[PDB]
Amino acid sequence: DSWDKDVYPEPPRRTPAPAPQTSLPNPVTYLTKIFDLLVDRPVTLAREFIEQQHAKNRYYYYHREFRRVPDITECEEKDILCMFEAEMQWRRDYKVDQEIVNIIQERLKACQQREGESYRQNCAKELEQFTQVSKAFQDRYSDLGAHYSARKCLAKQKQRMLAERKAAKEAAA
Amino acid sequence: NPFASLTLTTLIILTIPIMMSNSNIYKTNLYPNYVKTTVSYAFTLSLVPLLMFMHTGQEMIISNWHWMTLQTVELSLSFKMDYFSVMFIPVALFVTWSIMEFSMWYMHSDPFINRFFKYLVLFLITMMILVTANNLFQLFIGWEGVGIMSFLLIGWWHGRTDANTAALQAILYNRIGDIGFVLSMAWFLTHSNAWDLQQIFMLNNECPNMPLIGLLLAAAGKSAQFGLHPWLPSAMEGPTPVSALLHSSTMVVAGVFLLIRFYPLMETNKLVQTMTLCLGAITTLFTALCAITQNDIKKIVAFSTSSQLGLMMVTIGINQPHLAFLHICMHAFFKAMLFMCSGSIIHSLNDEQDIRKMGGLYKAMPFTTTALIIGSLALTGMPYLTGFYSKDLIIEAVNMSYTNAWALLMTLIATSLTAAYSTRIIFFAFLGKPRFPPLVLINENNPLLINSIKRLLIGSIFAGFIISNNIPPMTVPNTTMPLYMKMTALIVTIMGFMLALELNNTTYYLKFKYPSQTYKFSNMLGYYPSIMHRLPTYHNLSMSQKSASSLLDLIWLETILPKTTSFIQMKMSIMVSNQKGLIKLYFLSFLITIMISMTLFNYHE
Amino acid sequence: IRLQEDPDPEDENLYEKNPDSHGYDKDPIVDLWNMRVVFFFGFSIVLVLGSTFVAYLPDYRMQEWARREAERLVKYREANGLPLMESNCFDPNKIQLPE
Amino acid sequence: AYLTHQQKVLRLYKRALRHLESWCVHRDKYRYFACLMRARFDEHKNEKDMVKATQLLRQAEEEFWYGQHPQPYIFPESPGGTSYERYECYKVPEWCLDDWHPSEKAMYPDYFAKREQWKRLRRESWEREVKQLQEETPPGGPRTEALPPARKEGDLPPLWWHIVTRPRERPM
Amino acid sequence: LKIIIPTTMLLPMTWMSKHNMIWINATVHSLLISLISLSLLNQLGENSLNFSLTFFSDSLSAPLLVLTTWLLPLMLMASQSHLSKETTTRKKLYITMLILLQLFLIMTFTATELILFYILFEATLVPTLIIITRWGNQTERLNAGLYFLFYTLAGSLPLLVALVYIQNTTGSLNFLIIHYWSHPLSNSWSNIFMWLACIMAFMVKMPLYGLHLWLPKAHVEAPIAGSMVLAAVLLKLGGYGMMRITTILNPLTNYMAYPFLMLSMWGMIMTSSICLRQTDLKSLIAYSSVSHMALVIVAIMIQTPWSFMGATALMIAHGLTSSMLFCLANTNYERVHSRTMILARGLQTLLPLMATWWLMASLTNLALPPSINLIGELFIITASFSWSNITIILMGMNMMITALYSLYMLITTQRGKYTHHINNIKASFTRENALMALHILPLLLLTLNPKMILGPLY
Amino acid sequence: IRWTYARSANIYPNFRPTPKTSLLGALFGIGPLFFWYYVFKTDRDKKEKLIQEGKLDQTFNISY
Amino acid sequence: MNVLQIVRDHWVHILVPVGFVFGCYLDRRSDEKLTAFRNKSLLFKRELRPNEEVTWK
Numbered sequence A: 001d002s003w004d005k006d007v008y009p010e011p012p013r014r015t016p017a018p019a020p021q022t023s024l025p026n027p028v029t030y031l032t033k034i035f036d037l038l039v040d041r042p043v044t045l046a047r048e049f050i051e052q053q054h055a056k057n058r059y060y061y062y063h064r065e066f067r068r069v070p071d072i073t074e075c076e077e078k079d080i081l082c083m084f085e086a087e088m089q090w091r092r093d094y095k096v097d098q099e100i101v102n103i104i105q106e107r108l109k110a111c112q113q114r115e116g117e118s119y120r121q122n123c124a125k126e127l128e129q130f131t132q133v134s135k136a137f138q139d140r141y142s143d144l145g146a147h148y149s150a151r152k153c154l155a156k157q158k159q160r161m162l163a164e165r166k167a168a169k170e171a172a173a
Numbered sequence B: 001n002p003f004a005s006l007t008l009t010t011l012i013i014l015t016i017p018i019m020m021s022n023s024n025i026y027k028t029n030l031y032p033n034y035v036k037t038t039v040s041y042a043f044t045l046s047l048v049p050l051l052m053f054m055h056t057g058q059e060m061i062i063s064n065w066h067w068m069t070l071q072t073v074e075l076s077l078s079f080k081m082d083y084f085s086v087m088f089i090p091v092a093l094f095v096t097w098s099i100m101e102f103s104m105w106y107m108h109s110d111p112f113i114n115r116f117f118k119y120l121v122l123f124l125i126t127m128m129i130l131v132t133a134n135n136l137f138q139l140f141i142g143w144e145g146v147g148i149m150s151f152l153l154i155g156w157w158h159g160r161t162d163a164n165t166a167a168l169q170a171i172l173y174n175r176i177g178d179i180g181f182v183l184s185m186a187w188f189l190t191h192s193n194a195w196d197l198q199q200i201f202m203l204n205n206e207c208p209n210m211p212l213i214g215l216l217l218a219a220a221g222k223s224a225q226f227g228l229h230p231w232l233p234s235a236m237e238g239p240t241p242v243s244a245l246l247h248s249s250t251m252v253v254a255g256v257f258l259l260i261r262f263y264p265l266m267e268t269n270k271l272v273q274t275m276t277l278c279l280g281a282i283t284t285l286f287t288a289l290c291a292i293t294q295n296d297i298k299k300i301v302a303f304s305t306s307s308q309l310g311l312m313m314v315t316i317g318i319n320q321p322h323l324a325f326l327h328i329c330m331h332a333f334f335k336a337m338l339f340m341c342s343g344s345i346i347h348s349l350n351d352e353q354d355i356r357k358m359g360g361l362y363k364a365m366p367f368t369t370t371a372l373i374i375g376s377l378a379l380t381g382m383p384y385l386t387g388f389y390s391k392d393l394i395i396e397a398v399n400m401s402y403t404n405a406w407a408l409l410m411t412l413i414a415t416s417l418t419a420a421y422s423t424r425i426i427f428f429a430f431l432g433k434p435r436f437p438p439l440v441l442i443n444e445n446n447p448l449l450i451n452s453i454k455r456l457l458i459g460s461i462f463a464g465f466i467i468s469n470n471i472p473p474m475t476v477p478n479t480t481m482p483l484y485m486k487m488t489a490l491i492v493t494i495m496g497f498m499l500a501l502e503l504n505n506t507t508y509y510l511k512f513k514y515p516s517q518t519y520k521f522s523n524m525l526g527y528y529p530s531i532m533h534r535l536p537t538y539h540n541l542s543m544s545q546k547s548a549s550s551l552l553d554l555i556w557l558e559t560i561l562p563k564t565t566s567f568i569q570m571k572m573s574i575m576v577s578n579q580k581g582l583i584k585l586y587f588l589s590f591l592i593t594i595m596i597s598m599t600l601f602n603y604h605e
Numbered sequence C: 001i002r003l004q005e006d007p008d009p010e011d012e013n014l015y016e017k018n019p020d021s022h023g024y025d026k027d028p029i030v031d032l033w034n035m036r037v038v039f040f041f042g043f044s045i046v047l048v049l050g051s052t053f054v055a056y057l058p059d060y061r062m063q064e065w066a067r068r069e070a071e072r073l074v075k076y077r078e079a080n081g082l083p084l085m086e087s088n089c090f091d092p093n094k095i096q097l098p099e
Numbered sequence D: 001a002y003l004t005h006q007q008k009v010l011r012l013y014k015r016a017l018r019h020l021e022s023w024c025v026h027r028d029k030y031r032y033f034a035c036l037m038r039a040r041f042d043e044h045k046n047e048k049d050m051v052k053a054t055q056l057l058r059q060a061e062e063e064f065w066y067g068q069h070p071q072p073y074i075f076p077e078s079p080g081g082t083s084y085e086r087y088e089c090y091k092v093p094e095w096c097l098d099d100w101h102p103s104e105k106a107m108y109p110d111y112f113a114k115r116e117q118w119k120r121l122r123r124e125s126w127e128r129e130v131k132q133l134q135e136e137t138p139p140g141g142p143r144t145e146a147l148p149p150a151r152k153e154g155d156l157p158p159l160w161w162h163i164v165t166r167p168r169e170r171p172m
Numbered sequence E: 001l002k003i004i005i006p007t008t009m010l011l012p013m014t015w016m017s018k019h020n021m022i023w024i025n026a027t028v029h030s031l032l033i034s035l036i037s038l039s040l041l042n043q044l045g046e047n048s049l050n051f052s053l054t055f056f057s058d059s060l061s062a063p064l065l066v067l068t069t070w071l072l073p074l075m076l077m078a079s080q081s082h083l084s085k086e087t088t089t090r091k092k093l094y095i096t097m098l099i100l101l102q103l104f105l106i107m108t109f110t111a112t113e114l115i116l117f118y119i120l121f122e123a124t125l126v127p128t129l130i131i132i133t134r135w136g137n138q139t140e141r142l143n144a145g146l147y148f149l150f151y152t153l154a155g156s157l158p159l160l161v162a163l164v165y166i167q168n169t170t171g172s173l174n175f176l177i178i179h180y181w182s183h184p185l186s187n188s189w190s191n192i193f194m195w196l197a198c199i200m201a202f203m204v205k206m207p208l209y210g211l212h213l214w215l216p217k218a219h220v221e222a223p224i225a226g227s228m229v230l231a232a233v234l235l236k237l238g239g240y241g242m243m244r245i246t247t248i249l250n251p252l253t254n255y256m257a258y259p260f261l262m263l264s265m266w267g268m269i270m271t272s273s274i275c276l277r278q279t280d281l282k283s284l285i286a287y288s289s290v291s292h293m294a295l296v297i298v299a300i301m302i303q304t305p306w307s308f309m310g311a312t313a314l315m316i317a318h319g320l321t322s323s324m325l326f327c328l329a330n331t332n333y334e335r336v337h338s339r340t341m342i343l344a345r346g347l348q349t350l351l352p353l354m355a356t357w358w359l360m361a362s363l364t365n366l367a368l369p370p371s372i373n374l375i376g377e378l379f380i381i382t383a384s385f386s387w388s389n390i391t392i393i394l395m396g397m398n399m400m401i402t403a404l405y406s407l408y409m410l411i412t413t414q415r416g417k418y419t420h421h422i423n424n425i426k427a428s429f430t431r432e433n434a435l436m437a438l439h440i441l442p443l444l445l446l447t448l449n450p451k452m453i454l455g456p457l458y
Numbered sequence F: 001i002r003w004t005y006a007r008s009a010n011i012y013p014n015f016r017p018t019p020k021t022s023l024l025g026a027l028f029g030i031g032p033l034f035f036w037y038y039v040f041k042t043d044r045d046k047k048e049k050l051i052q053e054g055k056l057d058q059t060f061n062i063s064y
Numbered sequence G: 001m002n003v004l005q006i007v008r009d010h011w012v013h014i015l016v017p018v019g020f021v022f023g024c025y026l027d028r029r030s031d032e033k034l035t036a037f038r039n040k041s042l043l044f045k046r047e048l049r050p051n052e053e054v055t056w057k
């Protein structure tokens, strides 16, 4: 369809066959058929009129690709020139990572309702994906404050590396 | 597929009368009838989602329009189609449509009848997006729109200052409740990192101490439980249809509706349930206790509403969410009748609303007589009626469970009192002798009343079955129990009928009545409104002037920094300018300046 | 006399000259024009056309840009099995580890 | 100005049996204890001694405060009733009428024409009634809030406009 | 840059125009300049909109300028109640001060230099005391000017010494340069006073509990035009400053914030409680402004992403409503010629539409959802709760009082029974009703898509 | 008018810095401010103490 | 209607609209002085098309 069913995956849907054992007429069958043959058709004709009109002329848009630039790490100290570009990429990555956790949340949002009463089991993998996404996001941009920056994120990144390397060194012995 | 479109229309088609009202095209007269048809057509539209539900059971989420892409947070307009939502809608539309019929009967001389009907619809929208709200922000949208409209609605006649006093009191108690609501939002956004209800359930907060008590406090606000109870009985000050619709069947139960909507998360914490049993218990005892000896025709039934609310949230207390929702539909059915019936006899009895001057209306107004008796019998739990299928099933459930010790005895004792004031209201208002003023203007032959009462009347008689059987089994059925407490749901109401009847008959026995101390306790609403509305309000607001305004801002804060420095320059600027003008004193000073410069401090050295 | 002073003039309510006054000035025709001009140059353009000016604003902080080049980035990772977002934003091999 | 010994018992009786009605509820019960209230009231009619009479006031009121209904009964139209100042939402003062637009007063021409005549009566009788007032005020203003009546013919009773043009109790 | 020249260009506009066209000509061009200003929320992503060497804009400034450029028409028709009897030259000079005021606020928000910001920041004072003292109504308006200006300079002047000190140390104070060339603030005792000097200047133009005596002493006695502009944008000048100056005051901010945010926290309950016991109607909005303004003091102090968004959202929303309640103050005050709350009562039975504006004003100030007041206040609560869990019991208890005094003014003035002896209130002109409409509609119809209002961190 | 002056402006002209006003001013002034200082600082250091070795759980606490 | 009068009355509203067009000119006049990195940013190094000559102005 319009989206992709791998980044917005949808589990296959199973719907049982209508098997009314009772003899009295099923009302719900009646409401859908009048609904379909009185409202669903006219809006479809309006839509198909729209689609053919939208197919009369075809203007397009495209994707804005940004090539990779050196980050604030290899950026020279006090060098404003490459600092601006380095900061620009860091914040653009922040927007990208912000959407990544949004995608997982939306995947997590759809999973729970779709699984309904059995939401504890067929969404455990979704919960695991959200857990590591959230955990790694806290290792990434988090707690820097209102005036977050690439340097501040690099500062936190260095802080983790010094702590984890020192802890691994003493624990290994 | 149809489910998404039909339920959404039930919300959209409910708002056109508001926009047409703003267009001013309505030439009065037709507008109240126009409003009724929209609500009635909204009800009929709201059926076909419900009949869909029992057929299969599909429940959807209709998040449609994105509002905030707030970093990881994804605020969007989200409505959750679920059993609580899609079933409460026709019940809510049924009661509000029938009373919309009733409003024209009562208020026919009101010059602002169009504004009244517009207010009724605007509340309906604010409640509609509350019951079907998937994200917590939409819940607050409903939570606050409903409270604001109460202030407008029961403060309809600005007029008497007591109406505004009830308006200020009602909003203030509601204001206390949502403090926990904001606390829950902060906890959920910080810890659970979401505001939509279903995500919070997914993330499985197995120890949600702070969010749950805040939610419990929020329910304590709108449901008028202890601490925040007296706003319900005082809310009768507005028009009876307001009191018959807002805080008898719809608004006050919305507070209970919060906890049930959070039930998948609530039951994880055992501790949070102990105050729910605690709160609901004492509320049932207290509210019923006041209703026993009250006199205002609406005070008795308004206390019965709060007593009912304490009863139903006790159920969700002991792991009975769906049974609480079962009570949400039955209670909205017959309690509206009891308030609407009282509103009918008020209008006929030259707007008199004290049972001491009712009586003898059993034969004068038979239609209202039949409605109240069977309405009260449902309220007392007449077996195989609307009330019994919920109330007595609840009593059969709560007494047989792991719960607090005495906490099962209010719902036992309060049920006895629940039947007790039902007999008193029947005995004083309808039975007995006609103590009303000599000039009789009573009349109930208007078809608008007869159809309005009759619409829920077959509901209050036949609904109980038509919700009990069709809904899927969602609670464990109580099958094996002792005989005594299985029948005690029916026995307890019997002495509630019996002892109250004898006590009511004591008024017939010709002998003076001594004012009992316990009777004095019940007449003043158990002393809570007298004290809590006098001492805490006076002390805090007296501090607002003696200590806050006068002492600090007007005196202390303005004398420490600004006026001190103003006086410091003022205190000795005098002789800075005040000089005698003698050349002797000026030049003698020049001497000292010379010596201090080169000898004493010695800038050279 | 204490002080020669004009008495405080009364509030000349704008309706008494012209009952169709607009509370904008004394002159009637300017009052009519004052209502027309502020209502038109206000409510009409800045309130309605101003609304769709910023309601239909192009992509604000490239929000659509961020969403649509997020599915491609996430799709790359789990296909090869490595996590859909690392725990280290800047690359860790080239960063100089002090001592 | 004065609640003398006469009215105090008269007011005391009024609040006494009204509370009793709030107590007995039933008419037959109320009537028995009402006549007892009446009979016990005048059993000591001949009490020339005022000190005992004032004493008899003391056992009238303190147990009335004990014996008053904790939920006292009040009719809707009287202080504390359910309908006190209920219709103030509709009572708009008469002076708002002249502000009506020419279209609004052409809406009801006869009333406005009669209203103008009513305004006339106030205008050329005000100076007469204030002058009538002044010549009949005691020195140092009035010693009682009661207003004097119309002394001679023609002139309206002094200070009459608002008490006459008061909005109706049931305006709508 | 395209906003400033037409804004200056209105200076010859009003000063030359015909005797009766000065207000018509000024009203339209103030309405037309909202066009070019409305193209300032038109914004790129995280990078700020820098269109000149000396002028720049971002998602924090963008809501501010469109507020001020929109605001001036509001004070224009607001002043058309009591300036009619004045002479032409005085009438023309009133527009001169308002237009001169626009030229300043429109330029402080665009300033890309700390000193240039500060020069124009305190430059806005000179147009003000002309408004408050020359065109004021009561007697103590003279004391109003001294209280307002001396409070401002006593904090602003040490900031000037601080700014030049930063100029000498790091080299420049361009808002971008300090951001990119950031340096952590050491815990040295000298840095404490430099931090205090940098913040105190914006605190005084941010009514803090104790540094707020000029709030009731300026707004109440100021003219109607000066009242809203001083309460809607002028209080926000510090708000823009603190959001910018905090970029160079870390990590000293977190440890030093306790004396300040807490004083705002406790006073914001106190100041709201002041409104519960008041006798002057205009004092309600002044004190209510203090409590609402002090709310964002906490938000900026936490320096939390959510707090900054909530601060900006409440900043504009409070300015719009606080101005509105000042218009409703004016209409009632003009009709009754008094500022006493309890004098004019039962006004709804006489002015039903004016009651609706009173209803919407007090209810928006009540900050219900989804109004911008609520979303700004809610974001502050969540940020404050993350900082500390006890914060809810305090700032929540403000919302307790916030609903009270908001309805208290509505009940005692509009609701109830009218006082009989007032025979002055006429039907409301189309001016004030349109003035109220031009205040209420932008707030409501901004609620559908408020992401222009959250700020740069959005 | 007399009531307005008495409750708005006259308080300082007839104010006297008697000892009682000082205790009332101090108790209702810096009193609660320092009381909340004890409460807020204690939690802040307690919370900071707990996180610095990781007892407090922030598995999903990202929206700070 | 006496064009000279109608201009003596309504010519006032000229120098605010031209003030707007005055501003955008010096807005545009300020840009070309500020340009010193036309197509020099590493993130946008689009090759200069033969037909065109300037990346942006």
Ligand SMILES: CCCCCCCCCCCCCCCCCC(=O)OC[C@H](COP(=O)(O)OCCN)OC(=O)CCCCCCCCCCCCCCCCC
Pocket (backbone or CB within 6 Å): C029, C030, C033, C034, C037, E024, E028, E032, G009, G010, G011, G012, G013, G014, G017
């Ligand atoms: C682009 C150039 C703009 C400037 C030149 C063009 C101006 C006119 C623009 C079109 C106006 C259409 C409506 C015209 C109505 C004219 C009514 C009239 O003549 O009113 C005159 C009158 C003042 O008195 P007097 O002139 O003596 O006439 C009456 C004598 N008994 O009564 C009055 O009220 C005087 C008029 C009041 C003000 C009317 C509006 C003037 C401004 C209009 C343009 C505003 C926008 C400009 C920028 C547009 C592009 C962005």
